Design a protein around this ligand. Structure first.
Ligand SMILES: CCCCCCCC/C=C\CCCCCCCC(=O)O[C@@H](COC(=O)CCCCCCCCCCCCCCC)COP(=O)([O-])OCC[N+](C)(C)C
Ligand SMILES: CCCCCCCC/C=C\CCCCCCCC(=O)O[C@@H](COC(=O)CCCCCCCCCCCCCCC)COP(=O)([O-])OCC[N+](C)(C)C
Ligand SMILES: CCCCCCCC/C=C\CCCCCCCC(=O)O[C@@H](COC(=O)CCCCCCCCCCCCCCC)COP(=O)([O-])OCC[N+](C)(C)C
Ligand SMILES: CCCCCCCC/C=C\CCCCCCCC(=O)O[C@@H](COC(=O)CCCCCCCCCCCCCCC)COP(=O)([O-])OCC[N+](C)(C)C
Ligand SMILES: [K+]
Ligand SMILES: [K+]
Lengths: 294, 197, 197, 176
């Protein structure tokens, strides 16, 4: 079966795009050794960020990223043998209808973010290069691929911006707390995706024969039972690659990703705060007391 | 003009792809070499069939019917012996390593089907296909006279195309990593030298 | 007059029942859809029996005698083939998914009893019941031509009443949660407005 | 009062037992929630004057919240494992006793995790992920359980039981 053409579409677009951006900068450097630019600041930029009604370029792309991640949860549940539900149904058709927005939104960010090089190797740009081309290959071949799509879970990190723009989330302390909490959930769901991929496909030196049929939810559970250090061993990674990944996730998850100190300082920082505004209710009289109060 | 911030991230990515390429080649070295250092000791040889027959033993196989089906059915044991001309001696013919390790008693496994008659026919037509070639017809076949002089195979343990993929792709990431840092240090250090004009 | 303390706890309970309803619908979605998206691909069809017989094979079953009894007894294998008129082709009749997965070799399992004669009679009277209906009598039967064209069932994998319970009850808790917060915000905010008279 | 926790424990205990005597058929439902009544055991030892310092009242309050939570969570696992997953037609159930669920919770929350016993149903695994994440890092990871432990050690006495026939004297001022 084909598989490497889907992967190549991301590897080639990312590295090729890095090189053409680098070489476009390099030929401008060579030009002095050899010896519509207004429209990009107007269009899209005026609605993407710090412009209040910009929900169509943040809340929408977030809700579409959650939808694309839910569609990945749906897709990973099947034995991948279907030839009817994986087409003109709540699968590849709707998946392409969500992913075409990310192409437009990536282009809009590319034409706005002047510095192309810093933008190209920006983390959220990397999540688009490993998501979008594979889905074009999938609708061109009329064949779904359960590749690196789980990386759409890395979009949850900026969920604090949505609650802050909608004024749901109050103190800078509570913004730090929700930022930390979302980094945990998105990392947990991402690492479970890597184990899922690496266990459902065998080791290549074993002709891919030693694979294990873990569901994505068994990988989410395995990560939790491991990172809490319970380790029942009812589920564990059996492939050589899966064992290499678990050694990395144990060593990086403990003692670097956990073993913060600000998660307690922000927790007690949430307890010190005596109020903000005094909602003055009508009909009640009011008085203010100050000076040496003890 | 944030070029300093992008540039340092570009150099860190180049160093990451260098180190990732070197480490990936190291890891894939240790786990491919056990298969590869086995198969390079298995020699290609010429061999000729001495006899084809059933030994009257009967063995189990697993059939499938969809949804993790625990289907099982029996089949009759065939044996085939060859003269291995690289040793002038008997060996059993075994087709491939997966067949040998899934039943080392018998020369062939039928693709295990729902009905016993389909196993019987498959083994009988395989036996009949070899009954036409009990003779001097040299068979290009794989033998391990170094540590396994008893059985001979028609096929190798691995398709070398995936072995080669498994070394060319990490070597490409090492080459891209060094090529990224070597191209980018000019666009860093010589761009300012030529902009100072 | 502690109404502020009860009220805020009422709003928190309403929000809890909203979120609990939404999350419960999400969870039950992912685990019901694998069964449901299988059974909607299994079609209802018309089929007719070609033959009923014993194939002379014998299989184990587990009987019970109270207190985690490890009772086991054998029974004879029956097979029944049908023409599935939705494909004009052979299939085996298998009654239900639990029977098929507990022995995919045979068309029926007798309710496994203490004495062998009770297994034998049960299989023989089941065979005799089908011997009366080897003919054109169309049988409403369930087939999966999408990924399992070999076996046909008399019954579906799930009773849809528990599927519907498993979505109506969490949806009721979501509806109660929003109805709690929508009713209670009036008894909070408009009660004081009408008491100020 | 209606949405008070101890009122909720009565609504999930009492009507089912009326249904049970009306149908003349016991049901092993949410009755384990009666263990949540142990939380106020400090009031009994305080009213009977068995329990002394406010510090020892805080210590017994914390200790009773642990025992009642352990026995409650073991009840939820018991219920959720002895009945299967509904999408599995309830066929994948596991015959854990209540004491195997109490033991499983202790072996899990200490983070030993032998895996001689573990939750096999999909619902049981969802509950264990919740009890691991809520039990560690929120329910444990207090700080007052050490401050009250050393607060029990500072206290030099209360009353001087004056015994008859012995003479007595009191010394004060700069004593060092
Ligand atoms: C440095 C990263 C590059 C890795 C090389 C990638 C391809 C190397 C091998 C590529 C294979 C070469 C094929 C040879 C020709 C076929 C005949 C067939 O059937 C299956 O095994 C189905 C799943 C296989 C791939 C699915 C996930 C990707 C596998 C790999 C999982 C990710 C491995 C992650 C390793 C860190
Ligand atoms: C939120 C969404 C809840 C996911 C529920 C998935 C249930 C499910 O898919 O059952 C399947 C997975 O079986 C399991 O292993 C379930 C594991 C539950 C622990 C993961 C929950 C973590 C929540 C994280 C939230 C943050 C049952 O598998 P199956 O294919 O039926 O197995 C053969 C039959
Ligand atoms: C949001 C909460 C509502 C849940 C829906 C409740 C009923 C949904 C299904 C209800 C089932 C519908 C029945 C269909 C008609 C029958 C024919 C039969 O035999 C058994 O399985 C015995 C035990 C079953 C129930 C015992 C505990 C409750 C099961 C559920 C355990 C608690 C699940 C806790 C989930 C968090
Ligand atoms: C005072 C209250 C304490 C009451 C002690 C409970 C003892 C129960 C013993 C028991 O029921 O045996 C049964 C449970 O088998 C087990 O798994 C026992 C597990 C013991 C660990 C739980 C003790 C935790 C104490 C927490 C206290 C706080 C044996 O099972 P069975 O049905 O015999 O199995 C098939 C035969
Ligand atoms: K442990
Ligand atoms: K263990």
């Amino acid at each position: 079966r084909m598989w490497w053409a889907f992967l190549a579409s991301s590897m080639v677009t990312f590295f090729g795009g890095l090189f053409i951006i680098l070489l476009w900068r390099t030929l401008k450097y060579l030009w002095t050794v050899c010896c519509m630019t207004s429209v990009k600041d107007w269009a899209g930029v005026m609605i993407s960020a710090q412009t209040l009604t910009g929900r169509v370029l943040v809340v929408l792309v977030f809700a579409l990223s959650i939808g694309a991640l839910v569609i990945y949860f749906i897709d990973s549940s099947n034995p991948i043998e279907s030839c009817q539900n994986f087409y003109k149904d709540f699968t590849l058709q709707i998946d392409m209808a969500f992913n075409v927005f990310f192409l437009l939104y990536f282009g809009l960010r590319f034409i706005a973010a002047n510095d192309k090089l810093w933008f190209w190797l920006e983390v959220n740009s990397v999540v688009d290069f490993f998501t979008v081309p594979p889905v074009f290959v999938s609708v061109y071949l009329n064949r779904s691929w359960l590749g690196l799509r789980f990386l759409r879970a890395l979009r949850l990190i900026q969920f604090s911006e949505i609650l802050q723009f909608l004024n749901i989330l109050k103190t800078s302390n509570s913004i730090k707390l929700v930022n930390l909490l979302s980094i945990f959930i998105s990392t947990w769901l991402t690492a479970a995706g890597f184990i899922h991929l690496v266990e459902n496909s065998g080791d290549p030196w074993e002709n891919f024969q030693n694979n294990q049929a873990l569901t994505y939810w068994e990988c989410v559970y395995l990560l939790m039972v491991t990172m809490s250090t319970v380790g029942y061993g009812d589920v564990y990674a059996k492939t050589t690659l899966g064992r290499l990944f678990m050694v990395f996730f144990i060593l990086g998850g403990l003692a670097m990703f956990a073993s913060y100190v600000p998660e307690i300082i922000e927790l007690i920082g949430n307890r010190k705060k005596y109020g903000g505004s005094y909602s003055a209710v009508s009909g009640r009289k009011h008085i203010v007391v100050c000076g040496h109060i003890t | 003009t944030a070029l300093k911030a992008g540039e340092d991230k570009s150099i860190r990515l180049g160093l990451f792809l260098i180190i990732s390429g070197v480490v990936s080649l190291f890891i894939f070295g240790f786990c491919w070499l056990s298969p590869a250092l086995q198969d390079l000791q298995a020699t290609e040889a010429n061999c000729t069939v001495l006899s084809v027959q059933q030994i009257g033993e009967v063995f189990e196989c697993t059939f499938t019917c969809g949804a993790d089906c625990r289907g099982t059915s029996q089949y009759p044991c065939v044996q085939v012996y060859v003269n291995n001309s690289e040793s002038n001696s008997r060996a059993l013919l075994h087709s491939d390593e997966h067949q040998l390790l899934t039943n080392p008693k018998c020369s062939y496994i039928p693709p295990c089907k729902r009905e016993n008659q389909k196993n019987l026919e498959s083994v009988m037509n395989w036996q009949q296909y070899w009954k036409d070639e009990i003779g001097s017809q040299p068979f290009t076949c794989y033998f391990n006279q170094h540590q396994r002089p008893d059985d001979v195979l028609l096929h190798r343990t691995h398709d070398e195309i995936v072995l080669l993929h498994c070394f060319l792709w990490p070597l490409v990431t090492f080459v891209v990593g060094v090529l990224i840092v070597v191209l980018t240090i000019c666009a860093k250090s010589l761009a300012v030298k030529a902009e100072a004009m």
